[PDB]
PDB file of all heavy atoms in Angstrom:
ATOM      1  N   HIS A   1       5.727 -50.585 -15.234  1.00 15.89           N
ATOM      2  CA  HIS A   1       4.382 -50.057 -15.445  1.00 15.89           C
ATOM      3  C   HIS A   1       4.358 -48.833 -16.352  1.00 15.89           C
ATOM      4  O   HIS A   1       3.436 -48.733 -17.181  1.00 15.89           O
ATOM      5  CB  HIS A   1       3.729 -49.742 -14.095  1.00 15.89           C
ATOM      6  CG  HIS A   1       2.233 -49.749 -14.136  1.00 15.89           C
ATOM      7  ND1 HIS A   1       1.494 -48.651 -14.517  1.00 15.89           N
ATOM      8  CD2 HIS A   1       1.338 -50.726 -13.854  1.00 15.89           C
ATOM      9  CE1 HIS A   1       0.207 -48.948 -14.463  1.00 15.89           C
ATOM     10  NE2 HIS A   1       0.086 -50.201 -14.064  1.00 15.89           N
ATOM     11  N   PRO A   2       5.290 -47.881 -16.250  1.00 16.15           N
ATOM     12  CA  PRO A   2       5.269 -46.745 -17.184  1.00 16.15           C
ATOM     13  C   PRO A   2       5.277 -47.167 -18.639  1.00 16.15           C
ATOM     14  O   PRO A   2       4.730 -46.447 -19.483  1.00 16.15           O
ATOM     15  CB  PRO A   2       6.539 -45.970 -16.813  1.00 16.15           C
ATOM     16  CG  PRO A   2       6.751 -46.276 -15.379  1.00 16.15           C
ATOM     17  CD  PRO A   2       6.276 -47.687 -15.174  1.00 16.15           C
ATOM     18  N   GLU A   3       5.881 -48.310 -18.969  1.00 16.53           N
ATOM     19  CA  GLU A   3       5.798 -48.807 -20.337  1.00 16.53           C
ATOM     20  C   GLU A   3       4.351 -49.066 -20.735  1.00 16.53           C
ATOM     21  O   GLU A   3       3.912 -48.647 -21.812  1.00 16.53           O
ATOM     22  CB  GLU A   3       6.630 -50.082 -20.483  1.00 16.53           C
ATOM     23  CG  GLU A   3       8.096 -49.916 -20.112  1.00 16.53           C
ATOM     24  CD  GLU A   3       8.812 -48.915 -20.997  1.00 16.53           C
ATOM     25  OE1 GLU A   3       9.015 -49.214 -22.193  1.00 16.53           O
ATOM     26  OE2 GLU A   3       9.174 -47.829 -20.498  1.00 16.53           O
ATOM     27  N   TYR A   4       3.592 -49.743 -19.870  1.00 16.72           N
ATOM     28  CA  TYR A   4       2.178 -49.974 -20.151  1.00 16.72           C
ATOM     29  C   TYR A   4       1.412 -48.659 -20.209  1.00 16.72           C
ATOM     30  O   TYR A   4       0.529 -48.487 -21.057  1.00 16.72           O
ATOM     31  CB  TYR A   4       1.572 -50.896 -19.092  1.00 16.72           C
ATOM     32  CG  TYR A   4       2.394 -52.131 -18.795  1.00 16.72           C
ATOM     33  CD1 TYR A   4       2.486 -52.630 -17.502  1.00 16.72           C
ATOM     34  CD2 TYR A   4       3.076 -52.797 -19.804  1.00 16.72           C
ATOM     35  CE1 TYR A   4       3.235 -53.757 -17.223  1.00 16.72           C
ATOM     36  CE2 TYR A   4       3.826 -53.926 -19.535  1.00 16.72           C
ATOM     37  CZ  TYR A   4       3.902 -54.401 -18.242  1.00 16.72           C
ATOM     38  OH  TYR A   4       4.648 -55.525 -17.968  1.00 16.72           O
ATOM     39  N   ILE A   5       1.728 -47.728 -19.308  1.00 21.46           N
ATOM     40  CA  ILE A   5       1.060 -46.428 -19.310  1.00 21.46           C
ATOM     41  C   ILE A   5       1.254 -45.742 -20.655  1.00 21.46           C
ATOM     42  O   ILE A   5       0.299 -45.265 -21.278  1.00 21.46           O
ATOM     43  CB  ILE A   5       1.588 -45.556 -18.157  1.00 21.46           C
ATOM     44  CG1 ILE A   5       0.946 -45.980 -16.835  1.00 21.46           C
ATOM     45  CG2 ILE A   5       1.333 -44.076 -18.438  1.00 21.46           C
ATOM     46  CD1 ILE A   5       1.705 -45.515 -15.609  1.00 21.46           C
ATOM     47  N   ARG A   6       2.502 -45.678 -21.118  1.00 23.87           N
ATOM     48  CA  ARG A   6       2.792 -45.028 -22.391  1.00 23.87           C
ATOM     49  C   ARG A   6       2.109 -45.755 -23.539  1.00 23.87           C
ATOM     50  O   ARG A   6       1.524 -45.123 -24.427  1.00 23.87           O
ATOM     51  CB  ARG A   6       4.304 -44.969 -22.612  1.00 23.87           C
ATOM     52  CG  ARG A   6       4.725 -44.086 -23.775  1.00 23.87           C
ATOM     53  CD  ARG A   6       6.237 -44.059 -23.932  1.00 23.87           C
ATOM     54  NE  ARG A   6       6.772 -45.358 -24.327  1.00 23.87           N
ATOM     55  CZ  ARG A   6       7.273 -46.262 -23.495  1.00 23.87           C
ATOM     56  NH1 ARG A   6       7.264 -46.023 -22.186  1.00 23.87           N
ATOM     57  NH2 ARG A   6       7.777 -47.403 -23.938  1.00 23.87           N
ATOM     58  N   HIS A   7       2.157 -47.088 -23.535  1.00 21.69           N
ATOM     59  CA  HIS A   7       1.559 -47.847 -24.627  1.00 21.69           C
ATOM     60  C   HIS A   7       0.056 -47.616 -24.697  1.00 21.69           C
ATOM     61  O   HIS A   7      -0.511 -47.497 -25.790  1.00 21.69           O
ATOM     62  CB  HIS A   7       1.870 -49.335 -24.458  1.00 21.69           C
ATOM     63  CG  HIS A   7       1.911 -50.096 -25.746  1.00 21.69           C
ATOM     64  ND1 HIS A   7       2.151 -51.453 -25.800  1.00 21.69           N
ATOM     65  CD2 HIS A   7       1.740 -49.695 -27.029  1.00 21.69           C
ATOM     66  CE1 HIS A   7       2.127 -51.854 -27.059  1.00 21.69           C
ATOM     67  NE2 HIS A   7       1.880 -50.806 -27.825  1.00 21.69           N
ATOM     68  N   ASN A   8      -0.608 -47.543 -23.544  1.00 18.65           N
ATOM     69  CA  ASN A   8      -2.057 -47.408 -23.506  1.00 18.65           C
ATOM     70  C   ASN A   8      -2.532 -45.961 -23.526  1.00 18.65           C
ATOM     71  O   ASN A   8      -3.740 -45.732 -23.636  1.00 18.65           O
ATOM     72  CB  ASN A   8      -2.612 -48.103 -22.262  1.00 18.65           C
ATOM     73  CG  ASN A   8      -2.659 -49.607 -22.414  1.00 18.65           C
ATOM     74  OD1 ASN A   8      -1.640 -50.286 -22.287  1.00 18.65           O
ATOM     75  ND2 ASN A   8      -3.843 -50.138 -22.697  1.00 18.65           N
ATOM     76  N   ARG A   9      -1.635 -44.988 -23.419  1.00 19.78           N
ATOM     77  CA  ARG A   9      -2.039 -43.589 -23.466  1.00 19.78           C
ATOM     78  C   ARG A   9      -1.614 -42.878 -24.740  1.00 19.78           C
ATOM     79  O   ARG A   9      -2.394 -42.093 -25.286  1.00 19.78           O
ATOM     80  CB  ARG A   9      -1.479 -42.845 -22.246  1.00 19.78           C
ATOM     81  CG  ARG A   9      -2.076 -43.326 -20.932  1.00 19.78           C
ATOM     82  CD  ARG A   9      -1.882 -42.318 -19.812  1.00 19.78           C
ATOM     83  NE  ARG A   9      -2.526 -42.753 -18.577  1.00 19.78           N
ATOM     84  CZ  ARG A   9      -3.838 -42.842 -18.403  1.00 19.78           C
ATOM     85  NH1 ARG A   9      -4.653 -42.500 -19.397  1.00 19.78           N
ATOM     86  NH2 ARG A   9      -4.356 -43.265 -17.261  1.00 19.78           N
ATOM     87  N   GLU A  10      -0.400 -43.124 -25.233  1.00 18.94           N
ATOM     88  CA  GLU A  10       0.041 -42.486 -26.467  1.00 18.94           C
ATOM     89  C   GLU A  10      -0.587 -43.124 -27.699  1.00 18.94           C
ATOM     90  O   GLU A  10      -0.883 -42.421 -28.672  1.00 18.94           O
ATOM     91  CB  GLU A  10       1.566 -42.540 -26.570  1.00 18.94           C
ATOM     92  CG  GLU A  10       2.290 -41.806 -25.449  1.00 18.94           C
ATOM     93  CD  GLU A  10       2.000 -40.317 -25.445  1.00 18.94           C
ATOM     94  OE1 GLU A  10       1.624 -39.780 -26.507  1.00 18.94           O
ATOM     95  OE2 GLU A  10       2.150 -39.685 -24.378  1.00 18.94           O
ATOM     96  N   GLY A  11      -0.794 -44.439 -27.680  1.00 18.59           N
ATOM     97  CA  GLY A  11      -1.397 -45.135 -28.801  1.00 18.59           C
ATOM     98  C   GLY A  11      -2.497 -46.089 -28.381  1.00 18.59           C
ATOM     99  O   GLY A  11      -3.110 -46.755 -29.222  1.00 18.59           O
ATOM    100  N   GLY A  12      -2.752 -46.166 -27.077  1.00 17.16           N
ATOM    101  CA  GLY A  12      -3.784 -47.057 -26.579  1.00 17.16           C
ATOM    102  C   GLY A  12      -3.523 -48.513 -26.878  1.00 17.16           C
ATOM    103  O   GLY A  12      -4.473 -49.289 -27.009  1.00 17.16           O
ATOM    104  N   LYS A  13      -2.256 -48.911 -26.981  1.00 15.22           N
ATOM    105  CA  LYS A  13      -1.899 -50.266 -27.394  1.00 15.22           C
ATOM    106  C   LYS A  13      -2.552 -50.604 -28.732  1.00 15.22           C
ATOM    107  O   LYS A  13      -3.308 -51.569 -28.864  1.00 15.22           O
ATOM    108  CB  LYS A  13      -2.283 -51.287 -26.322  1.00 15.22           C
ATOM    109  CG  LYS A  13      -1.282 -51.391 -25.186  1.00 15.22           C
ATOM    110  CD  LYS A  13      -1.580 -52.578 -24.284  1.00 15.22           C
ATOM    111  CE  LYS A  13      -1.241 -53.897 -24.962  1.00 15.22           C
ATOM    112  NZ  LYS A  13      -1.292 -55.042 -24.012  1.00 15.22           N
ATOM    113  N   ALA A  14      -2.248 -49.786 -29.739  1.00 17.16           N
ATOM    114  CA  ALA A  14      -2.827 -49.936 -31.073  1.00 17.16           C
ATOM    115  C   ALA A  14      -4.350 -49.834 -31.026  1.00 17.16           C
ATOM    116  O   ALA A  14      -5.064 -50.597 -31.679  1.00 17.16           O
ATOM    117  CB  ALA A  14      -2.392 -51.254 -31.716  1.00 17.16           C
ATOM    118  N   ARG A  15      -4.853 -48.876 -30.245  1.00 18.84           N
ATOM    119  CA  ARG A  15      -6.286 -48.593 -30.158  1.00 18.84           C
ATOM    120  C   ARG A  15      -7.062 -49.832 -29.693  1.00 18.84           C
ATOM    121  O   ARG A  15      -7.897 -50.395 -30.404  1.00 18.84           O
ATOM    122  CB  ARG A  15      -6.812 -48.082 -31.505  1.00 18.84           C
ATOM    123  CG  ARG A  15      -8.023 -47.157 -31.404  1.00 18.84           C
ATOM    124  CD  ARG A  15      -9.285 -47.894 -30.975  1.00 18.84           C
ATOM    125  NE  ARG A  15      -9.614 -48.994 -31.876  1.00 18.84           N
ATOM    126  CZ  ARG A  15     -10.521 -49.929 -31.623  1.00 18.84           C
ATOM    127  NH1 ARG A  15     -11.197 -49.889 -30.477  1.00 18.84           N
ATOM    128  NH2 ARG A  15     -10.768 -50.902 -32.484  1.00 18.84           N
ATOM    129  N   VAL A  16      -6.753 -50.244 -28.467  1.00 19.67           N
ATOM    130  CA  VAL A  16      -7.497 -51.284 -27.768  1.00 19.67           C
ATOM    131  C   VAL A  16      -7.837 -50.764 -26.378  1.00 19.67           C
ATOM    132  O   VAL A  16      -6.949 -50.354 -25.621  1.00 19.67           O
ATOM    133  CB  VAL A  16      -6.705 -52.608 -27.692  1.00 19.67           C
ATOM    134  CG1 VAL A  16      -5.445 -52.441 -26.854  1.00 19.67           C
ATOM    135  CG2 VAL A  16      -7.581 -53.720 -27.132  1.00 19.67           C
ATOM    136  N   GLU A  17      -9.127 -50.771 -26.047  1.00 19.34           N
ATOM    137  CA  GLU A  17      -9.593 -50.216 -24.782  1.00 19.34           C
ATOM    138  C   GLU A  17      -9.077 -50.979 -23.570  1.00 19.34           C
ATOM    139  O   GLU A  17      -8.666 -50.356 -22.585  1.00 19.34           O
ATOM    140  CB  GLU A  17     -11.124 -50.190 -24.750  1.00 19.34           C
ATOM    141  CG  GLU A  17     -11.751 -49.180 -25.703  1.00 19.34           C
ATOM    142  CD  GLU A  17     -11.741 -49.644 -27.148  1.00 19.34           C
ATOM    143  OE1 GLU A  17     -11.674 -50.868 -27.383  1.00 19.34           O
ATOM    144  OE2 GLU A  17     -11.800 -48.781 -28.049  1.00 19.34           O
ATOM    145  N   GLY A  18      -9.089 -52.298 -23.615  1.00 19.16           N
ATOM    146  CA  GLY A  18      -8.660 -53.110 -22.494  1.00 19.16           C
ATOM    147  C   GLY A  18      -8.980 -54.571 -22.729  1.00 19.16           C
ATOM    148  O   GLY A  18      -9.366 -54.994 -23.817  1.00 19.16           O
ATOM    149  N   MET A  19      -8.816 -55.366 -21.673  1.00 18.76           N
ATOM    150  CA  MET A  19      -8.973 -56.811 -21.768  1.00 18.76           C
ATOM    151  C   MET A  19      -8.942 -57.415 -20.371  1.00 18.76           C
ATOM    152  O   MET A  19      -8.541 -56.765 -19.403  1.00 18.76           O
ATOM    153  CB  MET A  19      -7.874 -57.428 -22.651  1.00 18.76           C
ATOM    154  CG  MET A  19      -8.055 -58.908 -22.973  1.00 18.76           C
ATOM    155  SD  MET A  19      -9.623 -59.270 -23.788  1.00 18.76           S
ATOM    156  CE  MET A  19      -9.870 -60.976 -23.302  1.00 18.76           C
ATOM    157  N   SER A  20      -9.385 -58.666 -20.273  1.00 21.89           N
ATOM    158  CA  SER A  20      -9.414 -59.398 -19.014  1.00 21.89           C
ATOM    159  C   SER A  20      -8.424 -60.554 -19.068  1.00 21.89           C
ATOM    160  O   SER A  20      -8.331 -61.253 -20.083  1.00 21.89           O
ATOM    161  CB  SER A  20     -10.821 -59.924 -18.724  1.00 21.89           C
ATOM    162  OG  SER A  20     -10.862 -60.614 -17.487  1.00 21.89           O
ATOM    163  N   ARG A  21      -7.687 -60.749 -17.977  1.00 22.72           N
ATOM    164  CA  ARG A  21      -6.684 -61.805 -17.906  1.00 22.72           C
ATOM    165  C   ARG A  21      -6.285 -62.003 -16.450  1.00 22.72           C
ATOM    166  O   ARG A  21      -6.755 -61.297 -15.557  1.00 22.72           O
ATOM    167  CB  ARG A  21      -5.466 -61.476 -18.781  1.00 22.72           C
ATOM    168  CG  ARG A  21      -4.569 -60.361 -18.249  1.00 22.72           C
ATOM    169  CD  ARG A  21      -5.234 -58.998 -18.374  1.00 22.72           C
ATOM    170  NE  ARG A  21      -4.294 -57.904 -18.159  1.00 22.72           N
ATOM    171  CZ  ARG A  21      -4.638 -56.628 -18.048  1.00 22.72           C
ATOM    172  NH1 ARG A  21      -5.922 -56.290 -18.135  1.00 22.72           N
ATOM    173  NH2 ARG A  21      -3.733 -55.684 -17.852  1.00 22.72           N
ATOM    174  N   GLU A  22      -5.402 -62.972 -16.225  1.00 26.53           N
ATOM    175  CA  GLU A  22      -4.935 -63.267 -14.877  1.00 26.53           C
ATOM    176  C   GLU A  22      -3.729 -62.405 -14.524  1.00 26.53           C
ATOM    177  O   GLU A  22      -2.889 -62.106 -15.377  1.00 26.53           O
ATOM    178  CB  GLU A  22      -4.569 -64.745 -14.758  1.00 26.53           C
ATOM    179  CG  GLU A  22      -5.740 -65.690 -14.943  1.00 26.53           C
ATOM    180  CD  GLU A  22      -5.340 -67.144 -14.799  1.00 26.53           C
ATOM    181  OE1 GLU A  22      -4.200 -67.488 -15.179  1.00 26.53           O
ATOM    182  OE2 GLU A  22      -6.163 -67.944 -14.307  1.00 26.53           O
ATOM    183  N   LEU A  23      -3.641 -62.008 -13.255  1.00 22.91           N
ATOM    184  CA  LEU A  23      -2.503 -61.233 -12.779  1.00 22.91           C
ATOM    185  C   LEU A  23      -2.289 -61.521 -11.300  1.00 22.91           C
ATOM    186  O   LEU A  23      -3.231 -61.814 -10.562  1.00 22.91           O
ATOM    187  CB  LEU A  23      -2.709 -59.729 -13.004  1.00 22.91           C
ATOM    188  CG  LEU A  23      -2.401 -59.187 -14.402  1.00 22.91           C
ATOM    189  CD1 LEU A  23      -2.850 -57.739 -14.520  1.00 22.91           C
ATOM    190  CD2 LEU A  23      -0.917 -59.311 -14.725  1.00 22.91           C
ATOM    191  N   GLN A  24      -1.036 -61.420 -10.867  1.00 22.06           N
ATOM    192  CA  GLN A  24      -0.677 -61.643  -9.473  1.00 22.06           C
ATOM    193  C   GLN A  24      -0.747 -60.323  -8.717  1.00 22.06           C
ATOM    194  O   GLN A  24      -0.081 -59.352  -9.090  1.00 22.06           O
ATOM    195  CB  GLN A  24       0.721 -62.250  -9.354  1.00 22.06           C
ATOM    196  CG  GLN A  24       0.869 -63.207  -8.181  1.00 22.06           C
ATOM    197  CD  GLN A  24       2.180 -63.968  -8.206  1.00 22.06           C
ATOM    198  OE1 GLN A  24       3.046 -63.710  -9.041  1.00 22.06           O
ATOM    199  NE2 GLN A  24       2.330 -64.914  -7.286  1.00 22.06           N
ATOM    200  N   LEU A  25      -1.551 -60.295  -7.658  1.00 22.85           N
ATOM    201  CA  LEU A  25      -1.794 -59.090  -6.876  1.00 22.85           C
ATOM    202  C   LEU A  25      -1.073 -59.188  -5.541  1.00 22.85           C
ATOM    203  O   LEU A  25      -1.150 -60.217  -4.860  1.00 22.85           O
ATOM    204  CB  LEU A  25      -3.294 -58.879  -6.655  1.00 22.85           C
ATOM    205  CG  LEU A  25      -3.675 -57.646  -5.831  1.00 22.85           C
ATOM    206  CD1 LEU A  25      -4.897 -56.967  -6.428  1.00 22.85           C
ATOM    207  CD2 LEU A  25      -3.931 -58.020  -4.380  1.00 22.85           C
ATOM    208  N   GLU A  26      -0.378 -58.115  -5.171  1.00 19.33           N
ATOM    209  CA  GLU A  26       0.336 -58.044  -3.898  1.00 19.33           C
ATOM    210  C   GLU A  26      -0.583 -57.401  -2.867  1.00 19.33           C
ATOM    211  O   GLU A  26      -0.812 -56.190  -2.889  1.00 19.33           O
ATOM    212  CB  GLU A  26       1.631 -57.255  -4.055  1.00 19.33           C
ATOM    213  CG  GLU A  26       2.422 -57.091  -2.765  1.00 19.33           C
ATOM    214  CD  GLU A  26       3.683 -56.271  -2.956  1.00 19.33           C
ATOM    215  OE1 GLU A  26       3.745 -55.491  -3.930  1.00 19.33           O
ATOM    216  OE2 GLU A  26       4.612 -56.405  -2.132  1.00 19.33           O
ATOM    217  N   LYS A  27      -1.114 -58.213  -1.956  1.00 17.91           N
ATOM    218  CA  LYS A  27      -1.955 -57.685  -0.894  1.00 17.91           C
ATOM    219  C   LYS A  27      -1.125 -56.833   0.061  1.00 17.91           C
ATOM    220  O   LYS A  27       0.106 -56.915   0.102  1.00 17.91           O
ATOM    221  CB  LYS A  27      -2.639 -58.824  -0.135  1.00 17.91           C
ATOM    222  CG  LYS A  27      -3.932 -59.308  -0.777  1.00 17.91           C
ATOM    223  CD  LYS A  27      -4.682 -60.275   0.128  1.00 17.91           C
ATOM    224  CE  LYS A  27      -6.174 -60.281  -0.175  1.00 17.91           C
ATOM    225  NZ  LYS A  27      -6.940 -61.109   0.796  1.00 17.91           N
ATOM    226  N   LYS A  28      -1.820 -55.998   0.839  1.00 14.75           N
ATOM    227  CA  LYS A  28      -1.124 -55.105   1.759  1.00 14.75           C
ATOM    228  C   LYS A  28      -0.246 -55.881   2.730  1.00 14.75           C
ATOM    229  O   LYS A  28       0.753 -55.346   3.228  1.00 14.75           O
ATOM    230  CB  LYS A  28      -2.129 -54.243   2.521  1.00 14.75           C
ATOM    231  CG  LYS A  28      -1.503 -53.036   3.200  1.00 14.75           C
ATOM    232  CD  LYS A  28      -2.540 -52.180   3.906  1.00 14.75           C
ATOM    233  CE  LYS A  28      -1.900 -50.956   4.543  1.00 14.75           C
ATOM    234  NZ  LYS A  28      -2.879 -50.144   5.317  1.00 14.75           N
ATOM    235  N   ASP A  29      -0.597 -57.135   3.014  1.00 15.08           N
ATOM    236  CA  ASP A  29       0.258 -57.999   3.817  1.00 15.08           C
ATOM    237  C   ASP A  29       1.517 -58.430   3.077  1.00 15.08           C
ATOM    238  O   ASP A  29       2.410 -59.014   3.701  1.00 15.08           O
ATOM    239  CB  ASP A  29      -0.526 -59.234   4.267  1.00 15.08           C
ATOM    240  CG  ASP A  29      -1.043 -60.056   3.101  1.00 15.08           C
ATOM    241  OD1 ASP A  29      -0.723 -59.720   1.941  1.00 15.08           O
ATOM    242  OD2 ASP A  29      -1.773 -61.039   3.343  1.00 15.08           O
ATOM    243  N   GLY A  30       1.610 -58.158   1.775  1.00 16.98           N
ATOM    244  CA  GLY A  30       2.762 -58.530   0.984  1.00 16.98           C
ATOM    245  C   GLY A  30       2.613 -59.813   0.198  1.00 16.98           C
ATOM    246  O   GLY A  30       3.489 -60.123  -0.620  1.00 16.98           O
ATOM    247  N   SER A  31       1.537 -60.567   0.410  1.00 17.11           N
ATOM    248  CA  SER A  31       1.332 -61.824  -0.300  1.00 17.11           C
ATOM    249  C   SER A  31       0.972 -61.535  -1.752  1.00 17.11           C
ATOM    250  O   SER A  31       0.075 -60.733  -2.028  1.00 17.11           O
ATOM    251  CB  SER A  31       0.235 -62.642   0.375  1.00 17.11           C
ATOM    252  OG  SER A  31      -1.005 -61.956   0.338  1.00 17.11           O
ATOM    253  N   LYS A  32       1.672 -62.192  -2.679  1.00 16.66           N
ATOM    254  CA  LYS A  32       1.429 -62.024  -4.112  1.00 16.66           C
ATOM    255  C   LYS A  32       0.381 -63.045  -4.547  1.00 16.66           C
ATOM    256  O   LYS A  32       0.679 -64.100  -5.111  1.00 16.66           O
ATOM    257  CB  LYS A  32       2.724 -62.178  -4.897  1.00 16.66           C
ATOM    258  CG  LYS A  32       3.605 -60.940  -4.886  1.00 16.66           C
ATOM    259  CD  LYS A  32       4.810 -61.109  -5.797  1.00 16.66           C
ATOM    260  CE  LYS A  32       5.566 -59.802  -5.970  1.00 16.66           C
ATOM    261  NZ  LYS A  32       6.677 -59.930  -6.951  1.00 16.66           N
ATOM    262  N   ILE A  33      -0.882 -62.712  -4.273  1.00 20.61           N
ATOM    263  CA  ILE A  33      -1.979 -63.611  -4.610  1.00 20.61           C
ATOM    264  C   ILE A  33      -2.310 -63.496  -6.094  1.00 20.61           C
ATOM    265  O   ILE A  33      -2.083 -62.459  -6.731  1.00 20.61           O
ATOM    266  CB  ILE A  33      -3.213 -63.309  -3.740  1.00 20.61           C
ATOM    267  CG1 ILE A  33      -3.692 -61.868  -3.957  1.00 20.61           C
ATOM    268  CG2 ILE A  33      -2.894 -63.541  -2.271  1.00 20.61           C
ATOM    269  CD1 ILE A  33      -5.092 -61.612  -3.444  1.00 20.61           C
ATOM    270  N   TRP A  34      -2.853 -64.575  -6.649  1.00 22.28           N
ATOM    271  CA  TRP A  34      -3.306 -64.594  -8.032  1.00 22.28           C
ATOM    272  C   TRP A  34      -4.777 -64.203  -8.095  1.00 22.28           C
ATOM    273  O   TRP A  34      -5.581 -64.634  -7.263  1.00 22.28           O
ATOM    274  CB  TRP A  34      -3.104 -65.981  -8.643  1.00 22.28           C
ATOM    275  CG  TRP A  34      -1.667 -66.313  -8.923  1.00 22.28           C
ATOM    276  CD1 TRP A  34      -0.861 -67.141  -8.196  1.00 22.28           C
ATOM    277  CD2 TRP A  34      -0.869 -65.832 -10.012  1.00 22.28           C
ATOM    278  NE1 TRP A  34       0.389 -67.202  -8.762  1.00 22.28           N
ATOM    279  CE2 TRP A  34       0.410 -66.407  -9.878  1.00 22.28           C
ATOM    280  CE3 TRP A  34      -1.112 -64.969 -11.085  1.00 22.28           C
ATOM    281  CZ2 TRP A  34       1.442 -66.148 -10.775  1.00 22.28           C
ATOM    282  CZ3 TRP A  34      -0.085 -64.713 -11.976  1.00 22.28           C
ATOM    283  CH2 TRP A  34       1.176 -65.300 -11.816  1.00 22.28           C
ATOM    284  N   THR A  35      -5.126 -63.387  -9.089  1.00 20.85           N
ATOM    285  CA  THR A  35      -6.472 -62.851  -9.208  1.00 20.85           C
ATOM    286  C   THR A  35      -6.798 -62.657 -10.682  1.00 20.85           C
ATOM    287  O   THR A  35      -5.923 -62.729 -11.552  1.00 20.85           O
ATOM    288  CB  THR A  35      -6.624 -61.515  -8.465  1.00 20.85           C
ATOM    289  OG1 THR A  35      -5.927 -60.486  -9.180  1.00 20.85           O
ATOM    290  CG2 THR A  35      -6.066 -61.608  -7.050  1.00 20.85           C
ATOM    291  N   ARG A  36      -8.078 -62.415 -10.951  1.00 20.79           N
ATOM    292  CA  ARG A  36      -8.560 -62.095 -12.285  1.00 20.79           C
ATOM    293  C   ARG A  36      -8.702 -60.584 -12.396  1.00 20.79           C
ATOM    294  O   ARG A  36      -9.505 -59.978 -11.677  1.00 20.79           O
ATOM    295  CB  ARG A  36      -9.894 -62.785 -12.565  1.00 20.79           C
ATOM    296  CG  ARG A  36     -10.190 -62.960 -14.044  1.00 20.79           C
ATOM    297  CD  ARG A  36     -11.472 -63.739 -14.273  1.00 20.79           C
ATOM    298  NE  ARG A  36     -11.664 -64.061 -15.683  1.00 20.79           N
ATOM    299  CZ  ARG A  36     -11.146 -65.117 -16.297  1.00 20.79           C
ATOM    300  NH1 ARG A  36     -10.372 -65.956 -15.611  1.00 20.79           N
ATOM    301  NH2 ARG A  36     -11.376 -65.352 -17.577  1.00 20.79           N
ATOM    302  N   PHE A  37      -7.912 -59.985 -13.281  1.00 20.17           N
ATOM    303  CA  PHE A  37      -7.925 -58.558 -13.549  1.00 20.17           C
ATOM    304  C   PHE A  37      -8.626 -58.282 -14.875  1.00 20.17           C
ATOM    305  O   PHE A  37      -8.684 -59.133 -15.766  1.00 20.17           O
ATOM    306  CB  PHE A  37      -6.498 -58.005 -13.605  1.00 20.17           C
ATOM    307  CG  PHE A  37      -6.050 -57.334 -12.338  1.00 20.17           C
ATOM    308  CD1 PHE A  37      -5.754 -58.080 -11.209  1.00 20.17           C
ATOM    309  CD2 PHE A  37      -5.912 -55.958 -12.282  1.00 20.17           C
ATOM    310  CE1 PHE A  37      -5.335 -57.462 -10.046  1.00 20.17           C
ATOM    311  CE2 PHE A  37      -5.495 -55.336 -11.122  1.00 20.17           C
ATOM    312  CZ  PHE A  37      -5.205 -56.088 -10.003  1.00 20.17           C
ATOM    313  N   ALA A  38      -9.156 -57.068 -14.991  1.00 20.59           N
ATOM    314  CA  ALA A  38      -9.776 -56.603 -16.220  1.00 20.59           C
ATOM    315  C   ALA A  38      -9.535 -55.108 -16.345  1.00 20.59           C
ATOM    316  O   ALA A  38      -9.599 -54.371 -15.359  1.00 20.59           O
ATOM    317  CB  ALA A  38     -11.278 -56.907 -16.249  1.00 20.59           C
ATOM    318  N   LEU A  39      -9.263 -54.667 -17.572  1.00 18.35           N
ATOM    319  CA  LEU A  39      -8.983 -53.269 -17.859  1.00 18.35           C
ATOM    320  C   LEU A  39      -9.911 -52.792 -18.965  1.00 18.35           C
ATOM    321  O   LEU A  39     -10.264 -53.553 -19.870  1.00 18.35           O
ATOM    322  CB  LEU A  39      -7.521 -53.065 -18.281  1.00 18.35           C
ATOM    323  CG  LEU A  39      -7.151 -51.706 -18.885  1.00 18.35           C
ATOM    324  CD1 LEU A  39      -7.070 -50.647 -17.799  1.00 18.35           C
ATOM    325  CD2 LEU A  39      -5.845 -51.808 -19.647  1.00 18.35           C
ATOM    326  N   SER A  40     -10.293 -51.519 -18.882  1.00 17.68           N
ATOM    327  CA  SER A  40     -11.117 -50.899 -19.908  1.00 17.68           C
ATOM    328  C   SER A  40     -10.795 -49.414 -19.977  1.00 17.68           C
ATOM    329  O   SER A  40     -10.330 -48.817 -19.000  1.00 17.68           O
ATOM    330  CB  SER A  40     -12.611 -51.100 -19.626  1.00 17.68           C
ATOM    331  OG  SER A  40     -13.007 -52.431 -19.901  1.00 17.68           O
TER     332      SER A  40
END
């Protein structure tokens, strides 16, 4: 994750605010569920 942090903070990933895509989310129970994420 720090790689993404650096990419999106030092250069913003070549000046891109964000995007929507699929990502696997780890619920507090530990299950890695699939979900729709979006960043801005």
Side-chain angles (χ1 to χ4, degrees):
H1 204 275
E3 303 298 291
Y4 313 143
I5 282 161
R6 191 179 66 264
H7 208 181
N8 283 78
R9 294 199 177 292
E10 298 297 337
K13 279 190 72 170
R15 208 290 303 168
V16 65
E17 291 77 23
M19 188 57 206
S20 181
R21 72 288 193 189
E22 296 181 327
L23 278 172
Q24 213 171 6
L25 179 139
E26 178 182 22
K27 275 189 155 186
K28 196 178 182 184
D29 60 5
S31 62
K32 280 186 171 185
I33 60 164
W34 288 104
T35 72
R36 203 176 188 85
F37 261 73
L39 168 75
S40 286

